[PDB]
Design a protein around this nucleic acid. Structure first.
Ligand SMILES: [Mg+2]
Ligand SMILES: [Mg+2]
Ligand SMILES: [Mg+2]
Ligand SMILES: [Mg+2]
Ligand SMILES: [Mg+2]
Length: 45
RNA sequence: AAAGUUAUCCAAACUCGGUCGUUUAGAGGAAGUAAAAGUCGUAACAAGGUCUCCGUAGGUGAACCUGCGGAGGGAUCAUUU
């Protein structure tokens, strides 16, 4: 039995390249002030 | 005791030079405002199609472009061992 190793990276972007690669996107005026991380899907349908 | 006369003082006026202020002529050079049915491009306002702007330095017909350090008045108030 073998376990393939992992790889660890830390990418970091300017804002101009952040929303062209769809890392983040425009939010509404009221929804802007919400800094909780998005809830990742834990059921996947 | 009059004309006249000697030496100081108070001094108008003229001549030459210096200095300050106002007004005015000038070949040529370089800007601003307005008036246009002008010529050549399209820098900015939408991610204005290379995100925009600030200080500094260089370059190009013209708007402008590029290097170094900033700012968000941005196109992100946000990504977990
Ligand atoms: Mg003159
Ligand atoms: Mg003249
Ligand atoms: Mg431009
Ligand atoms: Mg802009
Ligand atoms: Mg704005």
């Amino acid at each position: 039995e073998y376990t393939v190793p992992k790889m660890y990276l830390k990418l970091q972007y300017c804002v101009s390249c952040a929303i062209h690669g769809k890392i983040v996107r425009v939010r509404s005026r009221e929804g802007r002030r919400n800094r909780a991380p998005p809830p990742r899907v834990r059921y996947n349908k």
